[model samples]
Structure formats: structure tokens, C-alpha cells
Target: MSMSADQVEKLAKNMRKSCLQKIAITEELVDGMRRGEFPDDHDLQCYTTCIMKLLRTFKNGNFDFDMIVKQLEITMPPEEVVIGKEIVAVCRNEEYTGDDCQKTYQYVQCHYKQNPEKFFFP
Candidate 1:
């Protein structure tokens, strides 16, 4: 669902501070990707893992994929909404075992690498 800028900003401001910080860091990381200065594979994987962890923290330890998608849909931009949903979908479908953060990160990074055009940074 689309959200107005005001509504988005309001919700973002009300979000957990840790989640806000992680989101800001992720924005910087995405900016680097846009500039063709992406992080190393391991770093990227760790950062992606960190992002998922922060989202889980924001949800009070509930790491439900649908919950993550709903939160992103309400707060993220159009491009991010699509990309985040795809990441969650892959992570969920693959059912990666052990160290979920790293597994999810690797899956998302691989998917993003394969379809770079699907992501947009602004």
C-alpha cells in the first residue's frame, strides 16, 4: 500500500531508535551500491544480516516475514517496497538453516546481484 510522505515520516519518527539507525545505515550502504562502490561480499552479507536483526528487534522478537513486509510497505519508498518484499520472499521460501541472518543475507545479496535493475536508490 502507498503512503503519503507525511504519514511515512510520522511512522518512521515513531519507530524504535535502533531500527531508525539501522535504516539510516542501510540507506548509506545502498547509496554506495548506487555509486558502484559496493561492500565486499562478506561485509554485505553481514550488513544484510544486521538489517534483518534490527527489523526483528523492532517487531519485539517476532521475525515474521509478512510482518516485515507490512512494516516496509508502510514506511519504505516504492522501489524499496518491491525490493524488500522480494528479499523476504526468497529468505522465507529457501528456509535457510542455522545462522538465519547470514543465510538470509546471502540469499538476498545473491538475488540483488542477479537483478540489480530491480533495485533503485534515491
Candidate 2:
């Protein structure tokens, strides 16, 4: 089902909060492993890898983030142009095989940067 703009905004806010919390917990786990608070073993190794993957996911650094976001045709606001550029850079530098994701990313960055005020409600 489709969601209203307000609903989408709320959902996005919740997602952002969840992402931050997950990253914080993952960092703590990794730090614990580093400080010898947790012994290095198969479990630690697995947790470390999982945490890394989670952080990458939160940062949209993982290719799957690109895959899903692109599939959804999600657009970012003017303030998020840096992320747009990052996605485009990843697409071009990493040879991301997605439909117009690079071009759209560049366009999004330039559009938002040039029309910053348009994104803000007056």
C-alpha cells in the first residue's frame, strides 16, 4: 500500500533512528572485541563481519543498498546531495549495474544543490 508524505516522513525518521542505534551497538561490540573484553574466536569473527555489514548498510555503502533504493526509485532531499554523489561515485567507480542510477544520482545532486530552498517548507 502507498503511504502519505507524512507517513513516509515518519517512517524515514524511525529508520534513521534505528540505523543510528544499530551502528552504536555494533561499534560497542567491535570495541569490546578489540579491548579483549570479548575473546576473539569464530563467534567474535562472525559478529565483527556482521557489524561491518550492518554499518555499510546504514551508510548505503553496500551494493545492496543501491540495489534496493534504486529499485524503489527513492529520491533524497537537497540536504542529502552528498549521499547522492556518494551513490553515483560508487556506481561509476564500482561499475554498479543499475538502471540510470549514476545519471539520476548526479542529477539529484545538482538539482538539490542548485535549488536548496525548494526542499524546505516556507
Candidate 3:
């Protein structure tokens, strides 16, 4: 029930396209994200949140830990799953300030910052 890292890009890119349309962000910003660059802009922030929400990473206005694990199991192999959780752990907090989308954006960016190798998006 897992996929290869190489296989991840196709699915992620597809979803990112949908999120792009849904969030109505600019091409430049999206390209920046694809290039592993993150800006603190609101639309860019919500862009990441849009994808996370589609992945069902959030629940009840907070990170659904189990859901994240489940999604990881679907996205990465067993060995990668271990690293995935660790990547997630450091990005997590007891509470975060800001709107739902903004908070998720912060967390995902933190994940990218700490371990870009473990992060992926469509």
C-alpha cells in the first residue's frame, strides 16, 4: 500500500494542479514551490494547505496524526514511513496561531525546511 519516491511525483503534480486551480495562485509562486522555495505569502501558504487538506492531513482543525500516518503509508514505503513520522514530528506543535490554512502552511514548510528529501508534493 505504498509507492516509490519516483512514483510520487506524478500523483503529487496532478494534485498540485488541482490545488493550484482551487487556490487560484499565480504560476510564479507555484513554480517557486516546485523549486523548493517557499514564500510567506498568504496565497502561497494556503496553496500548501489546500494540498494537505486534499491529503486529509488535517482533522478537527488540527493535524490528524493517524491520518498523516495513514497517508504516509499510502505514499511511502515502510522504511520511508519511519522517516516520514520523524519529519512530521519536528514540524508539529501543541498549538499554532493563525487560521487553519495558515497553520498547516507553516507546518508543511517547516517539514520542507528540515528535511526536503522527505517532502513531496504534486
Candidate 4:
């Protein structure tokens, strides 16, 4: 179901909060990896894998472009919605692939790196 603008705005606010929380938690894990503290490849993989799973859950595991665009239209400006759609597209394209977690992580990392100003923060 398509959401009203108010509902969409509320959802977007909550999403921003959740994203910040996830970033805080994930940053710790990333810092550990950077320090060579994880040591095991499995640990690193699991960290990113869990993050990917969380992100999928955040999106309700739905990658329908029309639905995503509609929701974004209600909650974000046109330009931001365009970027959001691209991010969603990347995630959708990687879904079910063996490297879904790794690919998604890299895509998000690059996006935020390139658009630091667009990074959502509380």
C-alpha cells in the first residue's frame, strides 16, 4: 500500500534514526576490522553479512521500484529520491547473489563516500 505524505515523513524520520544507529554499531565493527582485530575472515564476513541482513529488513525486503519511488517521493525531495532509487536498485540487483553482502556493503560505502553531504544523520 502507498503511504500518505505524513506517514511517509514519519517513516523517513524513523528510518534516519535507525540508519544512524546501524551506522554507529557497524562503525565499531569496521574499526575492529581496520585494526586487524577480527583476524578471521569469517568474522569480517559475518559482520558485513549481518549488516546486509539488517538493511534488507529495514527495507521490508521489498525491492519494487515503483513502490520505493512512491515512498521516496512522499518523504524526500526529487533529487534525493533519485539517489535513493539508485541505492535501492543496487541492492535489488545484488539480492540472492552469493556476494550480496559484500556487494551491498561496497555499494553503500562508495555512495556515502561520494556523497558525504547526503549521508543521513540524526
Candidate 5:
């Protein structure tokens, strides 16, 4: 509820436009992610990586906590910022090796597992 509905929706659309060109994720897969369902797959994972970088929360081959929190604060409330930090703390450090794409995807899955209510993609 922190971001304007139109604003968030537009951001998602634009991100999809950019990422889809780099990676081939299906429409069903995209909708599944929106529903908090991230299936394990290469293209889907890389799509997440693309969006995370484009979203500016990813850098140096990993989740940048400062970058993530900085962006979150701009659009979200203080409580959401706290939740964002929680996600970073618990999810970002999986250290799972599978290129940037897989790491990003793992973090996202962790976010869904730990804070599904706060999970977001735009």
C-alpha cells in the first residue's frame, strides 16, 4: 500500500518489457510470480535477476542491502523499510552459487518463505 497502484503497475510493466527481451519467461510464469509462486527454472530466475538489477536493489553480483533499503525508503513506509531489511538479512545471504540470476532467484524465494505478505516485484 505504500506505492501508488498506477505507479507500481507501470513499473512492473516496464520491467517486464525490458527483462523479457533478455530472458524468455512465459506469461504463465510471470503471473505465477505475482501470485507469490516462483517455480525453479533458469529463465525465470534470470528474469528476476534482471528486474532486481533494473530495480537497483542488486549490484556487485548480489543484493545490495543499502541499495535495497535506500530505494525502499523512497517509496515505502518506515515499517515496510524494516520489513525490507528483514528480507535482506534473512534472504540475501544464501550464498547460493548459480550466477547472479540464481542467487537473485533464491533471495526472492527466501523472501516469499519468510515474508510472503511483504513480497513485491516492482
Candidate 6:
């Protein structure tokens, strides 16, 4: 049987909340980086952990990818779902420019590769 509307809604809400939480954390990290208070890829480390956690949640059925994608589109539209590209353009562009940005870019690429089943589309 297919999922019910209530089930979809509940999952959607959870995904939206998770996306917003991640976005907020990323913003803070970006801001800190811009101020030069954060360097050495620490923010990337934190975000890597966060992304891993989020991906796991997606794998475990706690989230709806479609819902989360929509939330991301509204909050921070990416040219593509290749996390790194979007992160670079919208995030680093607004924040600082350094190795942290480069690392986040690479980190997300690896993350997506590690769990291609969950991330890859069409």
C-alpha cells in the first residue's frame, strides 16, 4: 500500500524542520567564517557530521526528500542538487571565501557519492 496523506504530511514537516535546522547552522558557520573567527575547516567538519546525520535520517525514513528539496528551494535555491554546487554559490558567496568553502564543496561531493542511492536522481 501507498503512504497516507497524513503520513506524507508528517514526514514532510519533519523534513522541512530538519532542512531549516541545517540551513540555520550553515548560516552561522558561514557568518563566523566571514568574520575570520572560524577557519581550519572546523565549520566544514561540523557540517559534514550534520550532512551525514541528515542523510542517515533520509535513509531511515524519517524524512521525505521531495519535501526537504522544496524547503531548500524556498530557503536557498540551488542550481542543482549536487549539494556542493549549491553550497558554493549561495553559501560561500554570501559568507567568506577560503579553504572552508573548497572543503565543503569537496566534502559534499564525497557525501553524495558515498550514498548515491539516497541522493542521485534521474
lDDT by candidate, in order shown = 0.54, 0.40, 0.76, 0.48, 0.76, 0.42
Sort every candidate by lDDT, greatest first: 5, 3, 1, 4, 6, 2
lDDT of 4 by residue, 9-119 (tens): 576456545654654444555545433333334344444544444434323333234654565565566556778777656655543433544444444444454455654
- What is the C-alpha RMSD, rounded to one decimal, of candidate 1? 5.7
Candidate 6 local lDDT, residue 93: 32
Tell me the alpha-carbon RMSD of every candidate: 5.7, 12.4, 2.3, 7.4, 2.6, 12.1
- Candidate 1's C-alpha runs over 4 A off are 1-41, 57-63, 76-91, 110-114, 120-122
TM-score result, candidate 2: 0.29
- Model 5 misplaced stretches (Cα beyond 4 Å): 1-3, 77-79
The stretch of ten residues in a row with the least summed lDDT in candidate 1 is: 54-63
Output the number of the lDDT-best candidate.
5
- Per-model TM-score on C-alpha atoms: 0.46, 0.29, 0.80, 0.37, 0.81, 0.24
- The alpha-carbon deviation from the true structure for residue 25 of candidate 6, after best TM-score superposition, in angstroms, is 5.3
Location of the lowest summed lDDT over 10 successive residues in candidate 2 = 96-105
For lDDT, candidate 3 versus 6, the one ahead is: 3
lDDT of 3 by residue, 33-54 (tens): 6467877788888887787777
Q: Residue 53 deviation, candidate 5, in Å?
A: 1.5
lDDT of 5 by residue, 1-122 (tens): 36765776788888888888778767678668758877778899888888889988887886777777776766666556777777667765666677888888887787778866766774
Candidate 6: minimum summed lDDT over ten consecutive residues — where? 56-65
Root mean square deviation (Cα) for candidate 4: 7.4
The better-scoring model by lDDT among 4 and 6 is 4
